[PDB]
Amino acid sequence: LADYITAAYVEMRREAWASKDATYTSARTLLAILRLSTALARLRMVDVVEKEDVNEAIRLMEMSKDSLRPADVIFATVRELVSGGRSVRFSEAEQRCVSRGFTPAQFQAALDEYEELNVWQVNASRTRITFV
Amino acid sequence: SVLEEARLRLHVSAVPESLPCREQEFQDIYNFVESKLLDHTGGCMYISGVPGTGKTATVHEVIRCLQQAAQANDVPPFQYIEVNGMKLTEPHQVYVQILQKLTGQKATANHAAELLAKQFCTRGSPQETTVLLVDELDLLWTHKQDIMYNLFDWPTHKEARLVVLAIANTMDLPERIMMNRVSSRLGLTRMCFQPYTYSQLQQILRSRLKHLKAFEDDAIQLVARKVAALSGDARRCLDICRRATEICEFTIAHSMEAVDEMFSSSYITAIKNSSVLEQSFLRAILAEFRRSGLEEATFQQIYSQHVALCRMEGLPYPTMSETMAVCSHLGSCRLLLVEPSRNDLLLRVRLNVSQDDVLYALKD
Ligand SMILES: Nc1ncnc2c1ncn2[C@@H]1O[C@H](COP(=O)(O)OP(=O)(O)OP(O)(O)=S)[C@@H](O)[C@H]1O
Ligand SMILES: [Mg+2]
């Protein structure tokens, strides 16, 4: 649970750094949340602290401080193949889109929908697409 | 040759006889003007549209059809007069132009206006219906608005027998440029020409190249689509097609080269072909801007940053005159902004291009 605790502490300290009116979240806050987790573990009568105790401690600290479409997915998939090139092969994009769990009909529908916006142009041979 | 024939067909001045792409607007104008010609009563219409929509061509074709109908003794005879606003040295001289077109008399601007007023307000001899075409209306503006008021008020008179069509690019003109009484005179008679859809552009291109197999459908579709997405103008489409033919003389590659050569900016390549000292000057400007955060900087701080960069790079120590000459050369090609005629060390410098473009040009 240390890694999750580290990530949660980083998130909380980043939030406290973004807000000027928040209390200074030094290592004392981490000590306090660790004490809260240990107290919760004692309360539940367990010799090992579980993630539920950490979640409850985070929730309590947050309450205390508070008291004060297929078209887009296919466009992103073909956007992943824009690594330094203006034109993308039709076969590669078709194979990659199908591997993501989309039927070729939805691929054609997404191609037409983003093609109406004229983001790109497709060759009639359906072999290459030049991105406008 | 086939390419030569395509070039001949695609020229701008090669006006077609009639394209049904605007047949609806043609029909509307054909009803309006026909009604104004049959009743021996004048009228006025305001037409606003972006350039390249074929407004002048459509009006001229309608005038051709009306003249043909008159030649076939179906419409009473009419006198046609055409004037262009931007082809006149002075605004008041339009009074002389119309008068000389109708009677050939030479008179002063005020006297020509008075004579035209007398002719159009007094019950004179029964004359043929007058068809007046005024081009580029917005350029006839005057602080007194007398010319515009007279132009759009004279056909209101019954004795005028005058039909006026005003072609302009801004549809807001009768609201924010024209005063209330004349705004109501042109009110509710505003024709707006929407830009051609890519289907319309493809139809126009196909009509240009009938019975000629010179271009592949893919190039044509892409050119029409770029035109739709950029301006929807037939003029630049014809220019792109001609350039594609020229490059083919030397596929989709030709159209792509035409579109990215006649539209793209040359700032990046100009910066790339710049000298080493100019690149160092640009880097010094960027560093000073990052240190300060302001978009204006005096020449002294830029000179200090340039000296520091030259010392870092091992370049020889530059003199103030050399840096000033380089800055003056850079300002000559409108890459910077400066007024070095009198001020030398206190010159404000502003970038003429975006910072990210400079970074993308200088990273390589
Ligand atoms: N009906 C049409 N179909 C296809 N192309 C046309 C049509 N009418 C005109 N064009 C073309 O479009 C061009 C623009 O026509 P114009 O009438 O000169 O432009 P405009 O709409 O009057 O705008 P400006 O700024 O006054 S040139 C013409 O020179 C022709 O090449
Ligand atoms: Mg015109």
From Swiss-Prot, chain A:
Remarks, miscellaneous: Early fractionation of eukaryotic MCM proteins yielded a variety of dimeric, trimeric and tetrameric complexes with unclear biological significance. Specifically a MCM467 subcomplex is shown to have in vitro helicase activity which is inhibited by the MCM2 subunit. The MCM2-7 hexamer is the proposed physiological active complex.
Role description: Acts as a component of the MCM2-7 complex (MCM complex) which is the replicative helicase essential for 'once per cell cycle' DNA replication initiation and elongation in eukaryotic cells. Core component of CDC45-MCM-GINS (CMG) helicase, the molecular machine that unwinds template DNA during replication, and around which the replisome is built.
Modification sites for Phosphoserine: 91
Domain of life: Eukaryota
Cell location: Nucleus; Chromosome
PTM per Swiss-Prot/TrEMBL: O-glycosylated (O-GlcNAcylated), in a cell cycle-dependent manner.
Protein name, per record: DNA replication licensing factor MCM7
Complexes and interactors: Component of the MCM2-7 complex. The complex forms a toroidal hexameric ring with the proposed subunit order MCM2-MCM6-MCM4-MCM7-MCM3-MCM5. Component of the CMG helicase complex, a hexameric ring of related MCM2-7 subunits stabilized by CDC45 and the tetrameric GINS complex. Interacts with the ATR-ATRIP complex and with RAD17. Interacts with TIPIN. Interacts with MCMBP. Interacts with ANKRD17. Component of the replisome complex composed of at least DONSON, MCM2, MCM7, PCNA and TICRR.
Annotated positions binding ATP 2: 28
Family designation: Belongs to the MCM family.
Region Interaction with ATRIP, annotated ranges: 1-132
Curated annotation (Swiss-Prot), chain B:
Entry coiled-coil feature ranges: none
Residues covered by region (Necessary and sufficient for ORC complex assembly): 16-364
Chain positions recorded as ATP binding sites: 15, 49-57, 136, 169, 235
UniProt binding sites for Mg(2+): 135-136
Subcellular compartments: Nucleus
Residues of the signal peptide: none
Effect of mutating residue 235 to Q: In MGORS1; abolished ATPase activity
Post-translational changes noted in the entry: Phosphorylated during mitosis.
Main function: Component of the origin recognition complex (ORC) that binds origins of replication. DNA-binding is ATP-dependent. The DNA sequences that define origins of replication have not been identified yet. ORC is required to assemble the pre-replication complex necessary to initiate DNA replication.
Family: Belongs to the ORC1 family.
Subunit structure: Component of ORC, a complex composed of at least 6 subunits: ORC1, ORC2, ORC3, ORC4, ORC5 and ORC6. ORC is regulated in a cell-cycle dependent manner. It is sequentially assembled at the exit from anaphase of mitosis and disassembled as cells enter S phase. Interacts with CDC6 and KAT7/HBO1. Interacts with LRWD1 predominantly during the G1 phase and with less affinity during mitosis, when phosphorylated.
Notes on the domains: The BAH domain mediates binding to dimethylated histone H4 'Lys-20' (H4K20me2), which is enriched at replication origins.
Involvement in disorder: Meier-Gorlin syndrome 1: A syndrome characterized by bilateral microtia, aplasia/hypoplasia of the patellae, and severe intrauterine and postnatal growth retardation with short stature and poor weight gain. Additional clinical findings include anomalies of cranial sutures, microcephaly, apparently low-set and simple ears, microstomia, full lips, highly arched or cleft palate, micrognathia, genitourinary tract anomalies, and various skeletal anomalies.
Protein name: Origin recognition complex subunit 1
Organism: Homo sapiens
